[PDB]
Design a protein around this ligand. Structure first.
Ligand SMILES: Nc1ncnc2c1ncn2[C@@H]1O[C@H](COP(=O)(O)OP(=O)(O)O)[C@@H](O)[C@H]1O
Ligand SMILES: [Mg+2]
Ligand SMILES: [Zn+2]
Ligand SMILES: [Zn+2]
Ligand SMILES: [Zn+2]
Ligand SMILES: [Zn+2]
Lengths: 222, 648, 637, 143, 49
């Protein structure tokens, strides 16, 4: 399953300092937890390394649960818990994870560049011919990861008297794809995220930023 | 000049070089023959020495005729505080033809000289007056251009006057006038005024001498106001085959929001031709130029229409002598008959119909029911005419349309629901989706004349229920949902079934209109044809004398405007009792089979007609005579007398 | 030497003095007590009364009003210092100053350019509200030519890069990289408002403009509400598709292109930096309040607390007032004679029942729908207009003037982001309220289907233009219907008289028939009432309770959810048996279990009207009587 | 290599995809015949410099090559839209889709409506690694 | 290239060649000048321009 679910309640009960650190710096703490869990599972079953060579630590039972209407810039880059109903869910697209390239000027295979969720990895020169030539992805050597884009809106039952439900986009990566369906009632724990490419830097536009939620954990309620 | 700021005039466009050329080897401006000094002196002479010989006291209100007209205007300006001097181009032409020609052909140059002259005179006199800005002179009444499409390119960038109808008015466009730059290093601030439509940015700080550190702060600049007026020209010279013309006008900083849709105006402004960019994102411009009018002066006055809402609202509209004359006319015994006979002098012996039309023009008493929580009450008078296509019903509708301001016309199936209420169109000058009004909304505070009301499909006919009941129009479409106001008076004309009133059928079936629609009308006139030799001979002589060809329209306009402005009739006790009795009797008579029944809507119709008659008499108090006239009119129209319980 | 804005600094000092010295009647520092609450997170605005400011220092208030835009940042910094020297708020936290109670109010038509940048207050009707996106207020850029960091460059309602790299020997004016982790953001919402009905001139569309709500004002205005926004008219640059050249900005440096690089055409424009100066008026609202607040101060206790002492005393008096039923009827419809049953039905509609959801999930409707069918000129439209004017969240529409999109909802795409905004329709604006459909019969089936789905499942499902949503529409329906041929026929059934679809008719809780009986007594009474109304306009109306009091009482009572006791159950079943026996002459429409459901809802509405915690046999009896009277007999020769 | 069942709901016209191209320099007119195009949805970045500059000291420009059409070995290629089997779509769900690229003799082999089984390479568009679409590192997949 | 392109492929990056026939050339001479021997300080190498 390549995934390990850890209760935030027990995490705070045992090691509270990390529990406090987690919402403020979700990306870094999650990466460190990923590496630690990978090492522990390798020690338990050394033969497991040949399966995806990567483990995802999901967090459950986050104490503070916000609401889609109550997400403000104050929450950026923090692990927030919300609930909602999926309105749209695109198909499971394949995303670049450790991308390798072909220099289409000498055919050398530029090595594996880790693909981040916020910036399109682009190489510089070719280490062999030192050319900034076009380059092109080498799909045979590249290793991908599942990417699903869902939209979760406020439950109409939870919407107020005079109000329209608000919707937030979320990204499921490589273990959560197709873990929810349009119409499902889901709790989403994820990083309210802003710094990928979303900035209306075009004319006739206020400098507002689009936002998404890097889903770190999903729990259907049914 | 008294140190008061000289306000920039966007209506004159971006300034020019103002280059001067000596015509000898006198000192004209390049490309013109204006001679700013001579022009200014001549305009001062005109302003201080113009007397209109054949003027009339009625025409000029609050102005001593013998004293110089525009000097009195300057006195009024000093009294009030609005630095706008409206000057008549016909007066300029009469005083000096050459000055008039120079003003017409070179407005952008001549007008500022007039501003200078007027300010010099006005501060040489009244030297202690306070004004937010110098005086601006607005010429108008130029030699009327009959058809705006007779204008050749050799008439570009010059003053013209056109007559038209306001179709649409855009939102306010903030036009920059003084950019405010601030250094992002040392915060030194400077201001750059519009040079020729361009703002030359600092490019270097005058404080720390850093290059390209001065950023333009948008909301600390000085801005102007601009508005786009889509006006459908109403030319009086119409050649064969030419279609209606729509023209674009631009109003600047004080004429913004001075005209609403449906308003018929005479606009005086500069005929401007401008390039059009092939794309919004490129600076290439098509070799063909599109023209538009930069507005200088609105004129809401017309000699062949009633007085507009703004004119009536303005207090100093009538002289005391004119007010007393109108009061005398109201004091006459047969003022109602006199006004009715004045209406439509070319149509013979429709006394009751013309009385109904007169009451429609006068309207009822506008009442505020907000506290009651009852909803607006229609004070307008709705009239239906019924008769074959041999009577003057259509002529009456055309006369009302050509008479009233804010008069819209519709006929047969040439209209639709969306085209009568509102729709959405991509503005073909800003490429934005703007909402456009229908005929009913365009005639908001006026009259909609609907000919051939019978041959009008139910989809468009059903809209009139809301207009004639609530005076509102609740358009609830995808983009925006809003309740427009259409306080219009309906003048409908419908034909009988089988296009003739067959005496073998009762009135209701001959009319062929729903009970609800007929009840929404407060007057119905069955223009039946009596087989009377006397009537036929009188009408024949009338028509032949018309072919081989009074109460003046001016005093008619004045009477109606005065009545609307001041008279606000209220119900007296005797009128209230008379109305109650009249409604009960009307219900009793109309409870027959084929008669047009009566409802509380008919009671309200009687109330409105009584208020209208009170206005006609300038009573300011509704009473028994008014109620009796309302009842008699509502009976004679629809001919309750000639009918019987066995309707037919 | 970083030239100082002396006027703004003086304003800042004076405003800080006002904050730290001004006191209320009690004599304590009211704004100190208020700023005590600013320490908590998700709380970064202080509300200050312009009345208090003017009282403390008239010159300061006038300066702020006349130079609001330029001085506002200094006021914010003053508030920041005021909070800091007291408490330990985070160093990076920003504070904002909202102003309220501005004495003067302007009109959206009067929002001219002369009002740009100076404090103002306007009244508008919210059309739609966009989502809450972070906005860039000041970003720190990196130069891609020399890696110099240009720090704290302000954003003027547009993505603005540094005008020039700081490094003197580097003229980079294009290649900058924003540093998001170093930039600061503020909450941002764009809400489209339009001119109110009163302000409309003759023959004009309501002018619409968008207002910008910053932090702490970002979800206070909702579509359809009447709200007063206080802030500053501003201009935001726009790339407008004007076919004609207009105002342009270019450098004053007198450069010229050499042969082969002639500064002409697109190259010349790009070299001179020619850029069009096109602006559009936008409103930057620092605060929003309801135009006509319901309470001077969402459960029953919360509403009670929100009420003032006088308001709650009045509500309690009305609740304790026996005959409150008739009193409310008369107050709501003082100008309508007769039709006591219709008035009672409309009142019970305004109050509503208790919606429920079964264990299986079925949503039992809780709000009642009323349809008035009658002869022409019988006050059906007047009832609809009365309810629209009185009730909040009371929308009105005609039979055929609205489309499906304009009657349920529509979808547009957020012009400032990737998300989708939902333009609410009439049935959404009437959510948790009333929708008044006049000429209900004259509506096309394409819209009757939408209305039926609304009345059926209390929701509107929209799948359009790239978005799917399920809006909630818990709106009661007040319909006005003309009988076929215009005049109701007493010898036929209701279905034969009206042309409403059977599914539509079946779920109308109450159907009131207004037959125009030509009776002398009623004629005289109605004539007297009408003539009295037209003679004594402002007087002649003596409603024992004002509309505002009734609205407050409705808002308080709606929070009550009456129970149903066993005695009430027994009485209900007995009354249903009696009504069924009535059904067994021929009624204008049969009696099914839908009549029992309507009666239960009416009993709940009566209990809620009296604010009782238990449905009582008196309420059940009143509901049964109303329903029985509504169901008329079909008289035939 | 993947074998999947589906139903073709569309089939684009059959067009010409080049398998070989001959590019000629504008200055010296020298050619670079027979450049092996990759198969599938993929493009080719033309050489920026005329390598045959040794025939004369004066040099050819930058980006000098024009593709010569008449010297291209083209083949039939077609685009089809496969839709999941209706009996395969779970109860409450949407039909998944896929894009099919068909070659010389796979063109017009099937028509809209046919229920087919496709054996092919699961590949992503490779066209130069360059409001909506907030994702990064995502390329149009196809079979 | 300045030429107003008519939608064709644009001219190359460095398209310009000198037209020696269409040039106006003038005489130009380079001279060496030396500090006058008397003007040179006693112990000093002469300056050159
Ligand atoms: N019973 C009544 N009490 C008070 N006013 C009435 C009554 N009946 C009719 N009216 C008046 O007559 C007019 C007709 O009412 P309206 O709502 O248009 O009826 P309908 O719905 O049949 O069109 C209204 O202006 C109303 O004030
Ligand atoms: Mg009605
Ligand atoms: Zn290489
Ligand atoms: Zn500086
Ligand atoms: Zn730099
Ligand atoms: Zn070559």
């Amino acid at each position: 399953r390549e995934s390990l679910v850890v209760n935030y309640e027990d995490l705070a009960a045992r090691e509270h300092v990390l529990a406090y650190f987690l919402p403020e710096a979700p990306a870094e703490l999650l990466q460190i937890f990923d590496e630690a869990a990978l090492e522990v599972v390798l020690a338990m079953y050394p033969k497991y390394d040949r399966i995806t060579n990567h483990i995802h630590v999901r967090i459950s039972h986050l104490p503070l649960v916000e609401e889609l209407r109550s997400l403000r810039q104050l929450h950026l880059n923090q692990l927030i818990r919300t609930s909602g109903v999926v309105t749209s869910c695109t198909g499971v697209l394949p995303q670049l994870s450790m991308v390798k390239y072909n220099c289409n000027k000498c055919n050398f295979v530029l090595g594996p560049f880790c693909q981040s969720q916020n910036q399109e990895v682009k190489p510089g020169s070719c280490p062999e011919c030192q050319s900034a030539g076009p380059f092109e992805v080498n799909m045979e050597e590249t290793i991908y990861q599942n990417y699903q884009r869902i939209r979760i809106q406020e439950s109409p039952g939870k919407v107020a008297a005079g109000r329209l439900p608000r919707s937030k986009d979320a990204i499921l990566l490589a273990d959560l794809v197709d873990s929810c369906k349009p119409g499902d009632e889901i709790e989403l724990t994820g990083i309210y995220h802003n710094n990928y490419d979303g900035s209306l830097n075009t004319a006739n536009g206020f400098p507002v930023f689009a936002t998404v939620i890097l889903a770190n954990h999903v729990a259907k309620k049914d | 000049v008294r140190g008061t700021p000289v306000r920039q005039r966007p209506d004159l466009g971006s300034a020019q070089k103002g280059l001067q050329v000596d015509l000898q080897s006198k000192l004209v401006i390049w490309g013109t023959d204006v001679n700013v000094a001579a022009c200014k002196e001549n305009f001062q002479r005109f302003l201080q020495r113009f007397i209109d010989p054949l003027a009339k006291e009625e025409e000029n209100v609050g102005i001593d005729i013998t004293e110089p007209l525009y000097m009195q205007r300057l006195g009024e300006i000093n009294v009030i505080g609005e630095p706008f001097l409206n000057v008549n181009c016909e007066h300029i032409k009469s005083f000096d033809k050459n000055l008039y020609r120079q003003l017409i052909s070179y407005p952008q140059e001549v007008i500022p000289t007039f501003d200078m002259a007027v300010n010099e005179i006005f501060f040489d006199r009244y030297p202690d007056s306070i004004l937010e800005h110098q005086i601006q002179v607005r010429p108008f009444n130029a030699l009327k251009t009959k058809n705006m499409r007779n204008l050749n390119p050799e008439d570009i960038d010059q003053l013209i006057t056109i007559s038209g109808m306001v179709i649409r008015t855009s939102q306010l466009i903030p036009e920059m006038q003084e950019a405010f730059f601030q250094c992002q290093v040392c915060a030194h601030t400077t201001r750059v005024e519009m040079d020729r439509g361009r703002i030359a940015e600092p490019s270097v700080c005058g404080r720390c001498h850093t290059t390209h550190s001065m950023a333009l702060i948008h909301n600390r600049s000085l801005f102007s106001d601009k508005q786009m007026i889509k006006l459908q020209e109403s030319p009086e010279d119409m050649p064969a085959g030419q279609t209606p013309h729509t023209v674009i006008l631009f109003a600047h900083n004080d004429l913004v929001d001075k005209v609403q849709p449906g308003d018929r105006v005479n606009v005086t402004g500069i005929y401007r031709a401008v390039p059009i960019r092939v794309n919004p994102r490129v600076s290439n411009v098509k070799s063909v130029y599109k023209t538009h009018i930069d507005v200088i002066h609105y004129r809401k006055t017309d000699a062949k229409r009633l007085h507009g809402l703004d004119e009536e609202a303005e207090q100093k509209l009538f002289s005391e002598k004119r007010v007393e004359l109108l009061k005398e006319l109201s004091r006459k015994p047969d003022i109602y008959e006199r006004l009715a006979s004045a209406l439509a002098p070319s149509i013979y012996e429709h006394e009751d119909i013309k009385k109904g039309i007169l009451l429609q023009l006068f309207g009822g008493t506008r009442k505020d029911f907000s506290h009651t929580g009852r909803g607006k009450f229609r004070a307008e008078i709705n009239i239906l005419l019924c008769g074959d296509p041999g009577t003057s019903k259509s002529q009456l509708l055309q006369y009302v349309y050509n008479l009233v301001p804010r008069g819209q016309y519709t006929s047969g199936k040439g209209s639709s629901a969306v085209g009568l209420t509102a729709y959405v169109m991509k503005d073909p000058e800003t490429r934005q989706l703007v909402l456009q009004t229908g005929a009913l909304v365009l005639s908001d505070n006026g009259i909609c004349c609907i000919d051939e009301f019978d041959k009008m499909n139910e989809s468009t006919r059903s809209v009139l229920h809301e207009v004639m009941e609530q005076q509102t129009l609740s358009i609830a479409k995808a983009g925006i949902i809003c309740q427009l106001n259409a306080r219009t008076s309906v003048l409908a004309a419908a034909n009988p079934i089988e296009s003739q009133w067959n005496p073998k059928k009762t009135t209701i079936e001959n009319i062929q209109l729903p009970h609800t629609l007929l009840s929404r009308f407060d007057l119905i006139f069955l223009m039946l044809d009596p087989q009377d030799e006397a009537y036929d001979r009188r009408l024949a002589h009338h028509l032949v004398a018309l072919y081989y060809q009074l109460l003046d329209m001016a005093v008619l306009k004045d009477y109606i405007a005065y009545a609307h402005s001041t008279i606000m009739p209220r119900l007296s006790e005797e009128a209230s009792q008379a109305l109650i009795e009249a409604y009960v009797d009307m219900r009793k008579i109309g409870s027959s089979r084929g008669m047009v029944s009566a409802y509380p809507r008919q009671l309200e119709s009687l109330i409105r007609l009584a208020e209208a008659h009170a206005k006609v008499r300038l009573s300011n108090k509704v009473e028994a005579i008014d109620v009796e006239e309302a009842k008699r009119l509502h009976r004679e129209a629809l001919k309750q007398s000639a009918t019987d319980p066995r309707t037919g | 030497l970083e030239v100082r804005d002396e006027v703004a600094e003086k304003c800042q000092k004076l405003f800080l003095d006002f904050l730290e010295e001004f006191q209320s009647s009690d004599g304590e520092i009211k704004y100190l007590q208020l700023a005590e609450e600013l320490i908590r997170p998700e709380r970064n605005t202080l509300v200050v009364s312009f009345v208090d400011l003017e009282q403390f220092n008239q010159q300061l208030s006038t300066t702020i009003q006349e130079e609001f835009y330029r001085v506002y940042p200094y006021l914010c910094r003053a508030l920041k210092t005021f909070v800091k020297d007291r408490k330990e708020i985070p160093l990076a936290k920003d504070f904002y100053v909202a102003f309220q109670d501005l004495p003067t109010r302007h009109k959206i038509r009067e929002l001219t350019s002369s009002r740009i940048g100076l404090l103002t207050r306007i009244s508008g009707q919210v059309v739609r509200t966009h989502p809450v996106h972070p906005e860039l207020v000041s970003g720190t850029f990196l130069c891609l030519d020399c890696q110099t960091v240009i720090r704290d460059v302000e954003q003027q309602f547009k993505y603005t890069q540094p005008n020039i790299c700081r490094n003197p020997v580097c003229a980079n004016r294009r290649r900058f990289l924003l540093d998001t982790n170093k930039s600061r953001f503020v909450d941002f919402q764009k809400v489209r408002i339009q001119e109110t009905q009163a302000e409309l001139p003759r023959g004009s569309i309501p002018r619409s403009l968008e207002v910008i709500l910053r932090a702490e004002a970002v979800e206070s205005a909702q579509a359809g509400d009447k709200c007063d926004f206080t802030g500053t008219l501003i201009v935001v640059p726009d790339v407008s598709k004007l076919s004609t050249p207009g105002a342009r900005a270019e450098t004053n440096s007198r450069v010229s292109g050499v042969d082969g690089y002639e500064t002409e055409g697109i190259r010349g424009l790009r070299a001179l930096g020619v850029r069009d100066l096109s602006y559009r008026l936008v409103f930057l609202a620092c605060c929003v309040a309801p135009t006509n607040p319901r309470f001077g101060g969402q459960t029953a206790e919360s509403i009670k607390n929100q009420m003032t002492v006088k308001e709650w005393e009045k509500v309690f008096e009305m609740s304790q007032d026996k005959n409150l039923y008739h009193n409310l009827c008369t107050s709501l419809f003082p100008t309508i004679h007769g039709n006591d049953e219709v008035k009672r039905g409309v009142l019970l509609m305004l109050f509503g029942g208790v919606p429920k959801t079964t264990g299986e999930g079925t949503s039992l409707r809780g709000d009642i729908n009323v349809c008035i069918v009658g002869d022409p000129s019988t006050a059906k439209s007047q009832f609809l207009k009365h309810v629209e004017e009185f009730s909040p969240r009371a929308v009105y529409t005609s039979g055929k003037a609205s489309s499906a999109a304009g009657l349920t909802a529509a979808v547009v795409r957020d012009e400032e982001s990737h998300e989708f905004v939902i333009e609410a329709g009439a049935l959404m604006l009437a959510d948790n309220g009333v929708c008044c459909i006049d000429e209900f019969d004259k509506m096309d089936v394409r819209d009757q289907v939408a209305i039926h789905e609304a009345m059926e499942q209390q929701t509107i499902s929209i799948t359009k233009a790239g978005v799917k949503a399920t809006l909630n529409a818990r709106t009661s329906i007040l319909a006005a219907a003309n009988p076929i041929s215009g005049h109701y026929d007493r010898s036929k059934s209701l279905k034969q008289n009206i042309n409403l679809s059977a599914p539509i008719m079946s779920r109308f809780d109450l159907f009131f028939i207004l037959v125009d009986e030509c009776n002398e007594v009623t004629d005289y009474a109605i004539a007297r009432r009408i003539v009295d109304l037209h003679s004594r306009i402002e007087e002649s109306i003596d409603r024992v309770y004002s509309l505002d009091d009734i609205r407050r009482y409705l808002l308080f009572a709606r929070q009550f959810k009456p129970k149903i006791s066993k005695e009430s159950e027994d009485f209900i079943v007995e009354q249903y048996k009696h009504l069924r026996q009535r059904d067994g002459t021929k009624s204008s429409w049969r009696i099914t279990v839908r009549q029992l459901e309507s009666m239960i809802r009416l009993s709940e509405a009566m209990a809620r009207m009296h604010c009782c915690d238990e449905v009582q046999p008196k309420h059940v009896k009143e509901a049964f009587r109303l329903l029985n009277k509504s169901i008329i007999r079909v008289e035939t020769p | 290599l993947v074998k999947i069942p589906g139903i073709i709901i569309a089939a684009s016209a059959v067009r010409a995809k080049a398998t070989r191209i001959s590019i000629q320099c504008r200055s010296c007119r020298n050619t670079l015949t027979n450049i092996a195009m990759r198969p599938g949805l993929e493009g080719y970045a033309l050489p920026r410099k005329c390598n045959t500059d040794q025939a004369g000291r004066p040099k050819c420009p930058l980006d000098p090559y024009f593709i010569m059409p008449d010297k291209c070995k083209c083949v039939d290629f077609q685009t089809l839209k496969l839709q999941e089997l209706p009996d395969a779509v779970p109860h409450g769900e949407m039909p998944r889709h896929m894009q099919l690229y068909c070659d010389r003799y796979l063109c017009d082999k099937v028509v809209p409506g046919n229920r087919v089984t496709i054996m092919g390479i699961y590949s992503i568009k490779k066209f130069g690694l360059t409001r909506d679409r907030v994702g990064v590192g995502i390329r149009s997949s196809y079979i």
